[PDB]
Amino acid sequence: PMPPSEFLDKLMGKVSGYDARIRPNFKGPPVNVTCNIFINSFGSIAETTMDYRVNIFLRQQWNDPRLAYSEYPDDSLDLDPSMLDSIWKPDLFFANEKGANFHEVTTDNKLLRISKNGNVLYSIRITLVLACPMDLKNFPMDVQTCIMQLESFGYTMNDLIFEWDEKGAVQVADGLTLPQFILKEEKDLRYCTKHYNTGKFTCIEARFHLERQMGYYLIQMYIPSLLIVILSWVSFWINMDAAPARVGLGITTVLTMTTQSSGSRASLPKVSYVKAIDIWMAVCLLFVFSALLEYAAVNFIARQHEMRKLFISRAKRIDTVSRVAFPLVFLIFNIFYWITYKII
Amino acid sequence: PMPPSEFLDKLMGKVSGYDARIRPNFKGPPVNVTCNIFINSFGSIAETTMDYRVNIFLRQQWNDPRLAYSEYPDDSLDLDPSMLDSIWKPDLFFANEKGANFHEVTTDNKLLRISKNGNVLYSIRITLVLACPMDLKNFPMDVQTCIMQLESFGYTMNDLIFEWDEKGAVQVADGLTLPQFILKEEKDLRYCTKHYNTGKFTCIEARFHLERQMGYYLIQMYIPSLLIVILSWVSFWINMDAAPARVGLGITTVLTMTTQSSGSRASLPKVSYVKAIDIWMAVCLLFVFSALLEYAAVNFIARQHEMRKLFISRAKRIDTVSRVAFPLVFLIFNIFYWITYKII
Amino acid sequence: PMPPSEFLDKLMGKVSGYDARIRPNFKGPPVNVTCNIFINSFGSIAETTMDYRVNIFLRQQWNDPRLAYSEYPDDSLDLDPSMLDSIWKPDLFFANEKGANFHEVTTDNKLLRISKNGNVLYSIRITLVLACPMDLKNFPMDVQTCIMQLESFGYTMNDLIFEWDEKGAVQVADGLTLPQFILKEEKDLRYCTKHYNTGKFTCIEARFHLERQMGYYLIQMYIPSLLIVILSWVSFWINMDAAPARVGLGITTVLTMTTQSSGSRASLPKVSYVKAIDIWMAVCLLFVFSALLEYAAVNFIARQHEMRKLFISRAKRIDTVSRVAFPLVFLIFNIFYWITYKII
Amino acid sequence: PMPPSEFLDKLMGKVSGYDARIRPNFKGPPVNVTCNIFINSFGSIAETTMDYRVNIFLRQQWNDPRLAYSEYPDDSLDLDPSMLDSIWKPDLFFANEKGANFHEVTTDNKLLRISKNGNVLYSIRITLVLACPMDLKNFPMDVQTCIMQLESFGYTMNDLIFEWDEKGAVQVADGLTLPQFILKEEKDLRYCTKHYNTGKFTCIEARFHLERQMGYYLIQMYIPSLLIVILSWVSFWINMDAAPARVGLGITTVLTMTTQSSGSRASLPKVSYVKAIDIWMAVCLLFVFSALLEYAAVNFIARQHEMRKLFISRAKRIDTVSRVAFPLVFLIFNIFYWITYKII
Amino acid sequence: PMPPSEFLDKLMGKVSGYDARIRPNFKGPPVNVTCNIFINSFGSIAETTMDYRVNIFLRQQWNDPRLAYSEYPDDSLDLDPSMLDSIWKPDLFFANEKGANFHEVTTDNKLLRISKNGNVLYSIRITLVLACPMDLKNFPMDVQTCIMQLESFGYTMNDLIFEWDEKGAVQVADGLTLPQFILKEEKDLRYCTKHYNTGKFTCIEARFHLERQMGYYLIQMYIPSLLIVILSWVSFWINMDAAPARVGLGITTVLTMTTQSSGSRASLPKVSYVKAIDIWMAVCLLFVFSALLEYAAVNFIARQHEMRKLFISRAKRIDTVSRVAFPLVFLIFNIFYWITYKII
Numbered sequence A, B, C, D, E: 001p002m003p004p005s006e007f008l009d010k011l012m013g014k015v016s017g018y019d020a021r022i023r024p025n026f027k028g029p030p031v032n033v034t035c036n037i038f039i040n041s042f043g044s045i046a047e048t049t050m051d052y053r054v055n056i057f058l059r060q061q062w063n064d065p066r067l068a069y070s071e072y073p074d075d076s077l078d079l080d081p082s083m084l085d086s087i088w089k090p091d092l093f094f095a096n097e098k099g100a101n102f103h104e105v106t107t108d109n110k111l112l113r114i115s116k117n118g119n120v121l122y123s124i125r126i127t128l129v130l131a132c133p134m135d136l137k138n139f140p141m142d143v144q145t146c147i148m149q150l151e152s153f154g155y156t157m158n159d160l161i162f163e164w165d166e167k168g169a170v171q172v173a174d175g176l177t178l179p180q181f182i183l184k185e186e187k188d189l190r191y192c193t194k195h196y197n198t199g200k201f202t203c204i205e206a207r208f209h210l211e212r213q214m215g216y217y218l219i220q221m222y223i224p225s226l227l228i229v230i231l232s233w234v235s236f237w238i239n240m241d242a243a244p245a246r247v248g249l250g251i252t253t254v255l256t257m258t259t260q261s262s263g264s265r266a267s268l269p270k271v272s273y274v275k276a277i278d279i280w281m282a283v284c285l286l287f288v289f290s291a292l293l294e295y296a297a298v299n300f301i302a303r304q305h306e307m308r309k310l311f312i313s314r315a316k317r318i319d320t321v322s323r324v325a326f327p328l329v330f331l332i333f334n335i336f337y338w339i340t341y342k343i344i
C-alpha cells in the first residue's frame, strides 16, 4: 500500500478532525492511563539536600478511539518522535521533581506506537532529582522510604485517572546496586490523590525502601571510638606516681573523642533531634571523661597527709575496682545499645 | 456543538479582534490581578549566599471581558498550554529572583481555564532561588524573615495592580517540614510598591518567619565547649608539684577551645559584628585561659624562698578558693547568658 | 482610534520602509545612546575566581526619527516584548562578562516605550558575573575597585557612542548591603574607549569602591594569634627546673601558630607577593619561636658546672629581662603595624 | 552540471518520495549500522559518583538504497549540517548516559557524506558522563572495567542491528594519558542485547580496562603509616623510668594512625566491605596499639615489690624480646600482604 | 541609492544563485582562512581537571568571490548578526574544547563585514574551557605549555586550509595578568594537521608558556617546613636528663611534618611520579625523624652501667657532633636542591 508515515498523516490531519488539544472520549468517561517505570540508574542519595537522582523509562498506555484503523495490514505503527506534537498525550508530572530533564542525544529518546484498536504505548527517558525527606532517628540503623509520585497537572479526576499496571509496575535493571544502601524487592504502590482550590487531581506513588549498609560506619566511627575507650583503660595499670603519664593520657583521649564526635556528623543535615550515633559518641565521651576524673580522685586522696598509710591504701583500692568496673559497665552498655538497634 | 478548542480559536482569532498584546479594559481602570501561591518545597537555606530555594504553584486570577462567552454550554474552557501565546497574561516577576526556571517535563507545567464571565485562572509551577538578607546578631537564637515579592515589569500602577486573595493567600503543602527551621503559620502580607525613574509599579510581598532549631548547635558547639571548661577545672585537684600535668592540661584546653571557636563559624557569612555564639566561645576561652594563669601564679609564689612555709601556705590558699570560684562565676555567667537569649 | 499595537505595526511594517537592521540617522552623525543602571543585587564577591555577581536593570535611551508619530493621541507607546525583533536596538555588551543571562520567568523581563518625538527607552534585567582583578597587598585593610564596562560590539565610534546620563547614572536599591564590604556612595564614571585591529569602539565604565569590614578578621585571625603569643609569655613565670613544662609549652604554641598561619589564606588566590596578614602571622610566629629559643639558652647556661652559683645567677638574669622585654617589643610592633595600615 | 546542494535537494525532496521518517529497506531485512568511536578526551573518573567523562567522535555507517545516484560525476556528497533533519538517521543512544550533550560552537560539530552506492557516513562529536560501577575490593591494586554501551531506542532487532567494524572499532587519540590510571590497548567488544516488555533492542558495548597507578598511594598513605609504626619501635630503646616519654610516645602514634586511617577514605564511596587499604591501616593500627600495651605490661610488672630484683629482671626480659619481635612480625606481615596483592 | 541591508539581500538571495551551503571557489583551490585571536580573559587554571578557561575574540578572514560588488559606493557592508545563516562560514572548532559557549546578552556577540573585493571578516566572542595536560615533575619550578588548536570538522585539506596571519596572530588584552602564573610574550604557532580514517583535516595551534610564581609556595610550604627542621635542632641543647622534653620535642616535629607533607598535595592530581615538593617534604621528614633517632642512641648508651664515666662521656660526644653535623648536612642539601631546580 502506502508508507506508514503517510497513512499516519491521514489519521492526524485536518481531514477526519483529529485535534491533539482534546482528550480521548471527550465529554465522556475519564481517560485511564496505566503506567510503569523501568529504573536504569539510581543513586547520589544526598542527605544535606535530602534528594536522590534516578534515571527511568516512563511508559504510559491509554486508548484513543480516534486512532483506530483497519485499512492498514500490520498491527502496529511506530510514530516518529519528530511528529509527537500532533497527537494527544497526558500531562503527567512529578510532584517532587526538584529538577528534571529529557535525553536528546543523537535522537530525542522518545517512543510511540499505536495498535489497531487504538492503544497508544508511549515511552520516554527521564532523569529526575526527586525529593525525599529523610528520617535519621537511628542513623546507621535506619530504613529510608524515598517515594516518587506521578500526577496530572491540568486534567482533573473526572477527565484523567492514572493507574499502575498489574504486570510488574516497577522494574529495576539487572545489575543495579547501591554503594551505601540496598533496594528491597517489595515496593509499595498506592494512591496519593491531591485536593487543591482548583480541583482534585490524580496521583499514583511508588515507595522504595532503602536499608543502609552497616559495615561502613563500623570501620570509620564505631571501631576507632571503641579503641580510644580502651586507650583510657590502660591508665589504670600505669603507676600513680607517674603524674604526666596518667594525666596526659586522659587529656588526649577526651579531646580525640571530641574530634571523633564532630566528624560523625560531617555529611549530615543539621537536625535538632538526637540520633543513634550521637548517643554512641556521647556515652563513649563519658567513659573517657570519667576515666580522667578517676585519677583526679586518686591524686587528691593519696596526697592527704598513720595518716599516710591509710591514704595510699584507700587510693589503691579505687584503682583495683576501676580496672574491673569500667570494662564491665561498658560491656553492659554495648548489650543494651546493640539489642535496642536490632529490635527496632 | 463544536469542540472547545475550535470555539476558543474563534475567541482568539483575527475575527472579533482579540489582540494578546493589549491588556483588558484598555484606556480604562487598571487590571486587578489577584494571586496566591502554593509552596510545594522549601529549603536549602544557604547563608554564605543568603538565599533559599522554593518550589511554588503561582495562581493568577484576572478578568478579560473580551473572553466572555454565552454560546457554549459548559461553564469553563481549559486552554491547552501549547496555545498560551495567544491570550494576554500579566508580566509578573520576582524582585529578588537570583535565578528561576519553569518545569517542562512531559508537558509544560502550565494551566489555564476561562469562565463564562471572562475570569481567567492561570497556574504555573516555578522554582525560585530567592534572596533574603540574613540577620545573625543572635545566631542560634534568631528568627529569620525571608520574603518574596511579586512585581510588574512593564505595566505601571495605572494599568495593572496586584493583590492577594483573602481566601488563604499562601498555602503550604501538608508534610512540608524543615531540617534546621520551623515555618510559622502566620504570614505577613503587605505592599511593597516600587518607584523608579520610569514610573511606579505594583508589588505585593509575603513574609515567612523562620525560627531555628536549637538542638543541633547544643550537641556540636555548646556541650563540647562546656566540657573543656570543666576539663580545665580538674587542674585544681592535681598536685602543685606535678608541673607538666597542670601545665600540659591548661595548654591542651586553651588550644582546643581555639579549634572549637574556629569551627563555630565554618558555614557562615563573614559578617563584622559579634554574635551570640561568638560571645560564648570568647568567654569560654577566657575561663580556660585564666585557669592556666592561675597555675602560673601558684608556680611563682610557691617558689619564693620562715620564708618557705609562708609561701606554700599562701599558694595553697588560692588553690582552695579557685576550686569554688571558677565553677561559681561560670554558673552565674550561664544565668546571664541564657536568660538574655530567651527574653530576646 | 485604532489600538496601539496595530498603530505600531504600521510604524514597523514593510510600508514606510522601517528596517530593524539599519541604525538611526544612517550615513549621518553617530547614534547617541545614554545609559544608566539600577543595581538590584550585588554580592558573592569571590577572590579565588576574582569575580562578582551583580543583578541590574539596564536602561538605554536613544532617538530614532523613523519612530516619530503625530496621528496617535497619547504620548507614549509600550511595545510588547514579543515584538522586540522588529526595531533597532544597540549591540551593547560587557567587556568583562564571564557569563551572563536574561530573566525570562513568567514573561521576558524586557521593557520598551516610544515617545512622540521618537525617543526609545529600553530597560532589561540582566544577571552578570563580572571579572574584577583583586589587589591584596594589605588584605584586611584594602579598598577594592571592581569595575563594569559597557561596549559596542559591531558599531564603531563613528556610528554609535555610549554615554552616561547626568541624572544619577548608577542607582542602587535601598536596602542593599554587603556582608563583607561596604559600597561607597561616590562612583567613578569615565570612558574606556577600545582600539583593535578592526576599529575603535565606544566604552563607558563605572567604578565601585569596596572597603572591607574589619571586624570579621579580628575575631578569627588577629585575636587568636595574639593569645598564643601571650601563651608563650607564661613560660617566663614557670620554674626553670620544670623542663617538660616550659619545653612542651613552647612546642605547642609554635605549631598552633603554624596551623593558624595556614588557615589565614584558606580562601585566597595563590598570589606571590606578601600581604598584611602574612606579615602579621610571620612576626607573631617569630615571637613564639624565639620564646622557645629563650629556654634553650636558659637550659644550656644553667647546666654549666664557684661555677654553679655563677651559672644559675646568670641564667636567672635573662629570665627577668625577658619577662619585660618580650611584651615590650610586641607592644612597639603593634604600634608600627596598625599605624601603617591606617595611614595607607 | 548543477551544484551539489541542489542535486541533493532533488534526492530528498517531495518528488521521488524520500521520507526521513522511514528506515531503509522497509518491510525487509534489518538495517545494519556499523559503528566506531574515536576517544578525544577521557578522564575525571569520579568514584563518589562512580562515573567518568569521555569526549568522542561517533561514526555511524549504513546503506540507504534511496540515496544512490549515478547522474552526478563525483563519488561523494557532503550534506551540510543545517539539512540533517531531512534524511533518516538511526536513533542510537547510550544506556548509561547520566548526561550528555552536543558541541555546537562556531558550527554544529556534525558531518555527513553519501557515496554513489548509497553508503552514509555520519560522524558527530559528543561529550558523555558515563556511569561505571566501581569495584574496590583491593583498592590501590585494582583493575577497573568501565564500559560504554550503544543501544537503539525505538527500532527493535528486526528493524535495526548495531555492529562494530572490524577495522579498529575503538581508536584513541595519540597523546591521551591519564593521571591516575593507564588505559590498556586490548579492548573487549561484545553484545549486550536488551529485552524489555516492549521488545528486544540491539546493543553493542566496549570495555575499557583501567589499571591504577601505584606510586601515588605509596607516598601519601603507605610510607607515612610505616614511619609511625617505626616511631612506636623507638619506645623500646628509651629507659623504663622515663614514664611520660614512653607513654606519651605511644599515645601520639596511636592517634595519628587514627588520623591517617580516616584520611585513607577521604575521597571514596561509602562501601560496606573491607578493602586492601583498610586492612593495611587496621593492622598498622594494631602494631602501634600493642606497642603501648607492651609498656603497660612493663610498668605493672616492674612495680611488683628478693622481690624487687626478680621483678626488674623479668620486665627487662620482655623489653629485649620486643626489640626483635615487633620488627620481625611486621616484616612477615609485609611479605604476606604484598605477595597477596601482586598475585591477585 | 538603496539601503545596504536590501543591497545585501540581493547579493544573498535566490536571484544570482548564492548558496550558503557551498564553499567559495568550489571545485577549485582550497579556501584559505586566516585567523587571529584576542584574549580577553585567561585563568582558573585547574590541575585536578587539567584545564583552563579562556575568553577570546575569534577573527576569521577569507575571500568569497560571489560577494564582490561594485554598484554600491562605500567600501564595506556590515551584515547584521540576525542574518548570519545566509552566507557561508567555515566550520572551525577546537580539538580540546571540553565545553564552550557563545555570548548572546543584549545581542549575539557576532560581527561580520564584507569588502568590495569579497573579503569577509568574521569576529565572534567565545568562552572555552580548554584541556591542557599538566607536567608536574618539578612542581613549583615548572613551565607549563597549555595549547589551543583550531580545526576543521567537515571540510578536508583539499577544501579548506587554516592559517595564522603574520600581523600578530595572538593578541592579549592590556591589563591581563595571572595570580599564579605569568604569560610569556613569545608564543609558538605551528601546524597540527590531523589524520583520521575519514581524511586529513587542517589544524593550527598556539602554545602559551606559563611560568609559575615562586613566592606563594615559599610562604606556605618551604618556610614552615624549614622551621620545624630547626625546631628539631633545639633538642641538642636541652639536657639529656630531661627525657620527656627531648622525646616529646621529636614526637611533635615528626608528626607535624607528616601533616605538612599531606597538605603539600591538597590541590593536585594524583600523579604517580615524584615531584620537587615531594622530595623536599621527604628529606625534611628524614631530618626530623633522625633527630629523634639521635636521642634514642643517647638514651641507650648513657644507661650502660669505670663503666658509668665512660658511658656518659661517649654519649656526650655524639651530642656535640650532632650540634654541628645536622645544620651542616641540611645546609649542603639546600645547595644541591635549589641549584638543581634553577638550572633546570
Ligand SMILES: *[C@@H]1O[C@H](CO)[C@@H](O[C@@H]2O[C@H](CO)[C@@H](O)[C@H](O)[C@H]2NC(C)=O)[C@H](O)[C@H]1NC(C)=O
Pocket: A025, A029, A030, A031, A032
Ligand atoms: C476507566 O476505568 C474505570 C473502571 O476501571 C471506568 O469507570 C467506571 O465505568 C463504569 C461503566 O462505564 C461505571 O459503572 C463506573 O461508575 C465507573 N467508575 C468506577 C470507580 O468503577 C471508566 O469507564 C474507564 N474509562 C474508560 C474511557 O474506559
Ligand SMILES: *[C@@H]1O[C@H](CO)[C@@H](O[C@@H]2O[C@H](CO)[C@@H](O)[C@H](O)[C@H]2NC(C)=O)[C@H](O)[C@H]1NC(C)=O
Pocket: B025, B029, B030, B031, B032
Ligand atoms: C480594581 O479594583 C479597584 C477597587 O478594588 C477599582 O478602583 C476603584 O474603582 C472605583 C470605581 O471604578 C473608583 O471609585 C475608585 O477611585 C478606584 N480606586 C480605588 C483605590 O478605590 C478598579 O476599578 C478595579 N479595576 C477593574 C477593571 O475592575
Ligand SMILES: *[C@@H]1O[C@H](CO)[C@@H](O[C@@H]2O[C@H](CO)[C@@H](O)[C@H](O)[C@H]2NC(C)=O)[C@H](O)[C@H]1NC(C)=O
Pocket: C025, C029, C030, C031, C032
Ligand atoms: C551625538 O552627540 C554629539 C554631541 O553631544 C554630536 O556630535 C557633534 O555634533 C555637532 C553638530 O552636529 C558637531 O559640531 C560636532 O563636531 C560633533 N562632535 C562633538 C565631539 O561635539 C552628535 O551630532 C550627536 N549625534 C546625534 C544623532 O544627535
Ligand SMILES: *[C@@H]1O[C@H](CO)[C@@H](O[C@@H]2O[C@H](CO)[C@@H](O)[C@H](O)[C@H]2NC(C)=O)[C@H](O)[C@H]1NC(C)=O
Pocket: D025, D029, D030, D031, D032
Ligand atoms: C544485515 O546483516 C545480516 C548478515 O550480516 C543479514 O542477515 C542475514 O541475511 C541473509 C540473507 O539475506 C539470511 O540468510 C540470514 O537469515 C540473515 N540473518 C543472519 C543472522 O545471518 C541482513 O540481511 C543484513 N541486512 C541488510 C539490509 O543488508
Ligand SMILES: *[C@@H]1O[C@H](CO)[C@@H](O[C@@H]2O[C@H](CO)[C@@H](O)[C@H](O)[C@H]2NC(C)=O)[C@H](O)[C@H]1NC(C)=O
Pocket: E025, E029, E030, E031, E032
Ligand atoms: C591558498 O593558498 C595557497 C598558497 O598560499 C594556494 O595554493 C597554491 O596555489 C598555487 C597556484 O594556484 C599552486 O601552484 C600551488 O600548488 C598551491 N599549493 C601550495 C602549497 O603552494 C591556494 O591557491 C590558495 N587558495 C586560494 C583560493 O587562493
